[PDB]
Amino acid sequence: MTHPDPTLFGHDPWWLMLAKAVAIFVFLLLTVLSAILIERKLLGRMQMRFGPNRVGPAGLLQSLADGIKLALKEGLVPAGVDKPIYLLAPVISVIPAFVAFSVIPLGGAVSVFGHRTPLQLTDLPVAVLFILAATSIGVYGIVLAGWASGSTYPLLGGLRSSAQVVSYEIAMGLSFVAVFLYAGTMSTSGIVAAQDRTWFVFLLLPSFLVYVVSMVGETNRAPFDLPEAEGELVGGFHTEYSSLKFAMFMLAEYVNMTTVSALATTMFLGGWHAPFPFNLIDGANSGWWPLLWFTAKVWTFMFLYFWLRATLPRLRYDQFMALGWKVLIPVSLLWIMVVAITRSLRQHGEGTWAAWLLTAAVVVVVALIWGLATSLRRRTVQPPPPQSTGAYPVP
Amino acid sequence: QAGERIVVNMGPQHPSTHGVLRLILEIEGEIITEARCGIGYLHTGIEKNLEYRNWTQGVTFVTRMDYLSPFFNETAYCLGVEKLLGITDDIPERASVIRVMLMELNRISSHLVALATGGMELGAMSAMFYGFREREEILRVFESITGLRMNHAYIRPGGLAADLPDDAITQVRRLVEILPKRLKDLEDLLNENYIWKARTVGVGYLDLTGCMALGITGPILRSTGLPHDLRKAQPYCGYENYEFDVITDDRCDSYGRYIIRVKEMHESVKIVEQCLARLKPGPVMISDKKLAWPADLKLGPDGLGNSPEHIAKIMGRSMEGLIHHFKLVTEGIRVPPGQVYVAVESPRGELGVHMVSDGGTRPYRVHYRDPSFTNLQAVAATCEGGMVADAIAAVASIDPVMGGVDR
Amino acid sequence: GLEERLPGGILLSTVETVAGYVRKGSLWPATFGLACCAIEMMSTAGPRFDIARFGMERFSATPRQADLMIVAGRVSQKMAPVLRQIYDQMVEPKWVLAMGVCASSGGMFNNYAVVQGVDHVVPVDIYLPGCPPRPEMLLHAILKLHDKIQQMPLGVNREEAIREAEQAALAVPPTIELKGLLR
Amino acid sequence: MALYTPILILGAIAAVFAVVSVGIALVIGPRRFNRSKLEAYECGIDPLPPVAAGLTGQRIPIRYYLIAMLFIVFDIEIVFLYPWAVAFDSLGLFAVIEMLLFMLTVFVAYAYVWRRGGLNWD
Amino acid sequence: SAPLRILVYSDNPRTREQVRLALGKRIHPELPEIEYVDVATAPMAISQMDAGGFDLAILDGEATPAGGMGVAKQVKDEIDDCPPILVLTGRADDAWLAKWSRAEAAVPHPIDPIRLSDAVVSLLR
Amino acid sequence: CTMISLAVLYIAQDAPFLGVVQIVVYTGAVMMLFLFVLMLIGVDLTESLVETIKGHRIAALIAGAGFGILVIAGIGNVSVAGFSGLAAANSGGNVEGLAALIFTRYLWAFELTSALLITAALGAMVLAHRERFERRKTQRELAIERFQTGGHPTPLPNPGVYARHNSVDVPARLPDGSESPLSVSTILPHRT
Amino acid sequence: FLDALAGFAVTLGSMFKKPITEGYPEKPGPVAPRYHGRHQLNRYPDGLEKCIGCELCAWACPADAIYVEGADNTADERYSPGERYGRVYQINYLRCIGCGLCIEACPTRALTMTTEY
Ligand SMILES: CC(C)=CCC/C(C)=C\CC/C(C)=C/CC/C(C)=C\CC/C(C)=C/CC/C(C)=C/CC/C(C)=C/CC/C(C)=C/CC/C(C)=C\CC1=C(C)C(=O)c2ccccc2C1=O
Ligand code: SF4
Ligand code: SF4
Ligand code: SF4
């Protein structure tokens, strides 16, 4: 009915909600370590390698080993940096990353120590927009890390991060709109409940795709990867950073990856609801199994991240911004109008018009996007004229 | 004005600058307003050090510049030495066929490295791994033939260091069979990829006029549509006997050069198949004992070393054979005084060699017009006006190998 | 570092062994290939081998995140200042692997243009022969460096080890004086 | 305060972890003063004399400043959709038409920007 | 009155012996007495110069595990108010790097006793 | 920091949506302002803040203090006259109540915000969007001029590399021993 | 056109293929039989050293990576057949480039190059 459900949220005793906060923090820590290791290994497999195989049993300690090594390595504070902001930028990047995850639904209501509590730290009337706000705050960490380093390459990385935001943030904001329309609420729990009938990925596929592209942009991951751009800016923003400051930048990147993957799961993949092969099982959506389903879907998104990194080259940040503003923003804005008109029509009984309009709109959008990708980006060019230097006779 | 311009060292230590290339870029925002190249961070004095080693020792030196095209360096050197000796017509047909086969496999390997490093510089992380997988197949073949993975000294003045091992032909056939299939994987990652094309197409444009003015050659020149290839014009090593098409494109940009390299790998595979067909048993070294490298390497339980038959001939039976072995190994042949220029089509363009002999046992003067050195003059044209990201793609398209640049 | 202020005993020994195990893994090389040996590092990373199996896949582009500087190439005169700058801009602990004969001793290029060994400008921890060293040789040298790192002391143990190594090194005669069996 | 004190607790945990991590970075591991180590990274080249720093790179132009400006207005405008979206069912047809008109106005502005080259530089 | 303390760094004990032989207890009777601190390892030399109290450091550019020029650059980048550095160069073409090391003076191998003594006097004066 | 703090205060004052929107939009806007600070003012320029208008600093401080004091005095005590809990209005959802008000009571202002957006876009395009006559030459265009860079000092000579000096500021040495003017970009001050 | 996504097939397919990495050091890969590994001084079947100390190997080395000194095979102490043997034989492997000219030079097959590396 009303989300967040008042009978379920806000009733946690201090000790229980502290325990849930600690459990969520540890879960994010373990998930970041697992992502670090599992990426390396999956990239290896995609490249027919093994990846970390020797540090610990089956290389399981590789990620933790790297973290401790960064801890044990000298903490550099270069001269010429803006020492206050230079030292704060890692914290500004990390804190919002973790805070955003607070409103992620990992599961339904569960009874622990005699208290029925939701399997999530909390939920808000504006939870999804709160996640967006926290992620937006996080980017200041990247930008200020680049700027405060007082060096050319970090500065270019920070500027690229600002361009990143300009490209993707409006896209995410618009992508949320269809989900809000269909769920009628911005609370994550309410969205998951609304996805009970069918997952919004099927109903809101354009919004899902736009959000996926825009979150891959948000996490500074390939194929966007612009703020770092190893091949162009050496280390990008995190150049001039070493030890746990660089480690915290990477930790923030991976926690943001987890946050956006979980948010995608919440809005579009029915959150923690069991998938079809298991949905028929009794109690699959009850107890602690929802945690398993939510983890599985989050990790499918992580697999998508790693797959994109392995397969795609990295765009020029101007090209990414062109994608965001000439494709993502227009597509999402048109899709919002299409969804609104369709829902209003069916609410008024004009179902046939609604279906026809939806199909025609998607067809037109896929035609026009193809035109942009092939006609606007024409695969033809003009010839060239001669000049002072004598030139051979062309074939 | 000045206040809005940074000047940044793309610097030697940078992933896309092959560690020893210094692109000094003046950038307004992120557009490359101006470009300069600090070169010589990888200078080695190979050209001078050659002067203090006999012939057939300078092979080991020259193979170590443009180290991604070792066989091309060696072939240019040996073609020059033979031309000064006047024995270019005396090289055994088998030796010429093997030289062509090795140069073409080397072209495939060098293009693989170029594509791998370019893709990695452009974020195509898996491109490097797939390219190096194919390159590792080729390097297995090279190691079997020559015993070295790199900087081979296998091609020697007057022929080859040693004949192919029995299994080398089968390995090269297996390459001719599997290599296009594996290259299909790398091509799929890049050829038609939207991001790859967007990242390379229209980037680093350089018209035919620019190529002529700067003396550019190789894939850069042939991306302008000019089908100039030293293998067809001014043939060498018997390239005239092979049916292959000179790959060329009309885009004049980075993507055109990339496609030219991709297609050149297939053309090289075709040429290697032709070499395998043409390959016949016979000597791999000139018959003239006064010049022929006397060594006869063979394997045994002890390892690789002079064959027991040669040992018996020189230490037990032939006094003249012993004298010839001793002299040709120690001080080597003495090349008649002269001055020659010999060019080959290395993967990056015309690899030229100006070589001067003063009649002695050592090269009086050996200079390599390495195509990378001249091609790097195109960086100012291909980077100025574009973004730093476009500069990375343009430089990768030039595909410089700083070993050949500095020498 | 507070890890150095820790007093000797089981605590410092355990800190040393944990640090050694941690640092031998995740020994990120610097993206600093030179000459032809760099192609062999890339091959070592290539699929046929896998540098990643040792936790060394991340070739830190910036010297800040790099732990191991595999020089891996011939250092020209003009490049020595750049190489030293890169080494300095890495942060402790630092290790240098002189991959190839050129990096280790100048190799075949005994002339003006080459520095005749990386150690002329930065401390070298392992010398690796080969021209180039095949990737298995590079992995062997890297594992030898791992063994060296594992035994690396800390704090008071570091000071005592430095003093003992000094006492030992002061006595070794130079190679020029090892005239064994020379006529 | 309910529904937020969990966010506050998690934020406190994260802030403590981050500040402790920075402190660990600074106080754990060896420290060795070195002028070359501390100076800026310039791909190995000597950094440009900071004494003459105030002559270049003082101001960094951005080639997408126009898109940067439009971003502010569009970001602040689209947020009108969220209350509209959540209350969509409760509002009714008149509100749908109102929002369609508003989005058509936004589309007119956006199309004016796009077709006149406002989105081309970067 | 203070005995000038000189740091002699070289993996080769014979180079240290030659340095300590060209220089004596007194470079000249007008100069103070000289005390020599032999160091064979770069870490030990760095630790010694960290403790300070040195008037001159003689670093062998030919040192095996860590050449003298690298140590000179390191000490001038790491020790504040470090003593003047004299570098022994293994060849003429090393002179350029000797400049890069910023060593106050360079003396080629083989160490000419008089040239070394004169350079040391010039640096101490 | 101030915008985020005000957002938190809004959240505390039973305005969750307003606070979150504050965080989002002002994060974006302040990032854009930071970009424009870099573009127009400087990356790390330290402004003097010395009063350039004689006696203006003291007068401005006095005026600000007086205005603030008078505003606070006028406000006085207001909540003493009753402070209704917002829970009645937020019942049924804060965002839903905001939507009901915006699209019923204030739909006119909501629509006019579109006019504000259009005017902002038009102003940005008219005043800031440089037209064809000032379009920077493309690399393709810059690569053809006569022979673009090419024939013109090909790539300009690299900056000189000396022992103890290899920055881009250093000038290269001509055979006569003089510094090559082309070796160092004109923007840099000749030094090093 | 699905062709533009062909790369995704390549990486995904290669996920399910067995990795092609050689298992060095535990399971080192096979080097070529002709590989130029460590030099080795061989003996005759009776145990005498083959190296006659002719210094041809050192002569031909382009990197001066071999130092050899000969000595007489006195009847009281003979190490190789003939009247000369290699008393001192050193290879500076930090100068060796593995070119293999030494083994080509050796007139007795005393010097070979094993596959050990
Ligand atoms: C902080 C704290 C204590 C918290 C408590 C909890 C805790 C302990 C941990 C929490 C989690 C944390 C923080 C974990 C720590 C780890 C962490 C944060 C992340 C770091 C790890 C990480 C990011 C891993 C994944 C990154 C990744 C996928 C890396 C792989 C990159 C790859 C594929 C690199 C290979 C590139 C390559 C082949 C390099 C060779 C290039 C070189 C060196 C040669 C140079 C060179 C080149 C490049 C030419 O182009 C060239 C061309 C022609 C001739 C010559 C050359 C030439 O010389
Ligand atoms: S050791 Fe050999 S392969 Fe390595 S850089 Fe030197 S010459 Fe090139
Ligand atoms: S060439 Fe052979 S026989 Fe002569 S010294 Fe060398 S190893 Fe001994
Ligand atoms: S392999 Fe070549 S360089 Fe090495 S010792 Fe033998 S002949 Fe000399």
Domains of chain D: 4-116 (1.20.58.1610)
CB B41 within 8 A of CB B402: yes
Query: Which atom of ligand 2 lies closest to the CA of C35?
Result: 5
The count of residues in chain C is 183
Determine which residue's CA is closest to atom 49 belonging to ligand 1. B18
Quick check: F128 contacting E, CB < 8 Å?
A: no
Unique residue bearing structure tokens 């989105």:
D119
CB F38 within 8 A of CB A159: yes
Q: What is the spatial distance between Cα F125 and Cα F138, in angstroms, rounded to a whole number?
A: 22
Neighbour-count burial of B146, counting CB atoms closer than 10 A to its CB (0-12 exposed, 13-18 middle, 19+ buried): buried
Alpha carbon nearest to ligand 3 atom 6, residue: G57
| Contact assessment for residue C50 and residue A49, using Cβ atoms and an 8 Å cutoff | yes
Question: Which of these, B152, B156, B163, lies nearest to B82 by C-alpha position?
Answer: B156
Looking at chain B, how many residues does it have? 407
Buried/exposed code over A9-23 (b: 16+ C-beta within 10 A; e: otherwise): bbebeeebbbbbbee
Please give the interface size between A and G, counted as residue pairs whose CB atoms are below 8 Å apart.
Answer: 29
Q: Show the domain range for B280.
A: 2-406
Taking CB atoms and an 8 Å cutoff, what residues of chain B touch C131? 64, 151
Residue C118 lies in a domain: yes
Q: Going by CA atoms, what residue is nearest to atom 3 of ligand 4?
A: G96
User: CB under 8 Å to C58, separation ≥6 — which residues?
Assistant: C26, C28, C65
User: Which site among B18, B43, B109 would you substitute to test the C interface, given the most C Cβ atoms closer than 10 Å to its Cβ?
Assistant: B43
> Residue A55 in contact with residue C23, Cβ under 8 Å?
no
The three-state secondary structure class of B266 is helix
E115 CB-side CA count, 13 A: 11
Identify which of F95, F32, D19 has the alpha carbon closest to the alpha carbon of residue A136: F32
Assess if residue C57 is contained within a domain: yes
Q: Tell me which of C21, C40, C42, C71 to substitute to probe ligand 1's pocket, judged by most ligand atoms within 8 Å of the beta carbon.
A: C42
Residue C183 falls within a domain, yes or no? no
Our CA dihedral for G18, G24, G29, G35, rounded to 10 degrees, sits at 150
| Any ligand 4 atom below 6 A from CB of G88 | no
Q: Could you tell me what percentage of chain E is helix, strand and coil, using 3-state DSSP and rounding each to the nearest 5?
A: 40, 20, 40
Please identify which residue in the block is written with the tokens 């020792």. Answer: B57
Chain Cα centroid distance, residue C19: 17
The DSSP code sequence of F64-103 is HHHHHHHHHHHH-S-GGG----THHHHTT-HHHHHHHIII
**Cβ atoms C92, D30 nearer than 8 A:** yes
Distance between first and last Cα of chain G:
50
Residue C6's domain comprises 2-177
Asked if A301 contacts A256 with a C-beta cutoff of 8 angstroms, the reply is no
How far is B66 from chain D, CA to nearest CA, in Å? 23
DSSP-H helix ranges across C46-124:
80-89, 100-105
Q: Which one-letter DSSP state was computed for residue B240?
A: G
Q: Which residue has the tokens 């997988």?
A: B133
Does the beta carbon of G51 sit less than 6 angstroms from any atom of ligand 3? yes
E-only strand ranges, B317-390: 338-346, 349-357, 365-369
User: Is G65's C-beta closer than 6 angstroms to any atom of ligand 3?
Assistant: no
Read off the CATH number of the domain in which F64 is found. 1.20.120.1200
Nearest-Cα residue of chain D relative to residue B9? D42
Identify which of A246, D73, G30 has the alpha carbon closest to the alpha carbon of residue C91.
Answer: A246
Q: Which residue, among C14, C59, C12, C15, has the nearest Cα to C38 in the 3D structure? A: C59
Structure determined via? cryo-EM
Measured at the CA of G53, the angle between CA G48 and CA G54, to 5 degrees, comes to: 130
Neighbours of B26 (CB within 10 A): 23
Distance CA B68, CA B46 (A): 16
Question: Whole domain around residue F122: which residue ranges?
Answer: 1-132
Other beta carbons less than 10 A from residue D75's beta carbon? 24
Cα–Cα dist A138/A144, whole Å: 10
β-bridge pairing C126-128 and C95-99: parallel
CA of G92 to the centre of ligand 4 (A): 9
The CATH number of G2-117, from 3.30.70.3270, 3.90.550.10, 3.10.20.30, 3.30.470.20, is 3.30.70.3270
Three-state DSSP state, C40: helix
B64 interfaces chain C, CB cutoff of 8 Å: yes
Q: Cα–Cα distance between E41 and C165 in angstroms, integer?
A: 8
Cα distance between residue A177 and residue D84, in whole Å: 9
Nearest C-alpha neighbor of E63 from the set E6, E18, E12: E12
Interatomic CA distance for residues G62 and B53, integer angstroms? 7
Domains in chain G: boundaries: 2-117
Would you tell me how many other CB atoms lie within 10 Å of the CB of residue A212?
A: 19
Contact call for residues C72 and C33 (beta carbons, < 8 A): yes
- Under DSSP, the state recorded for B376 is G
The rounded Cα G30 to chain-centroid distance in angstroms is 15
Residue type, C132: P
Q: Strand E34-39 vs strand G66-72: parallel, antiparallel, or unpaired?
A: unpaired
Residue C178 DSSP class: -
**Resolution of this structure in Å:** 2.7
Q: Residue C98 forms beta bridges with which residues?
A: C127
Which ligand lies nearest to the CA atom of residue G100 in the structure? Answer: 4
**Residues of chain F contacting residue C81, judged by C-beta atoms under 8 Å apart:** 163, 166
Residue range(s) defining the domain that contains residue E64: 1-125
What total number of domains does chain E contain? 1
Q: Which chains touch E (3 or more CB pairs under 8 A)?
A: C, D, F
The CA distance from F161 to C85, in Å, is: 14
Residues flagged as binding site of G: 51, 54, 57, 61, 96, 99, 102, 106
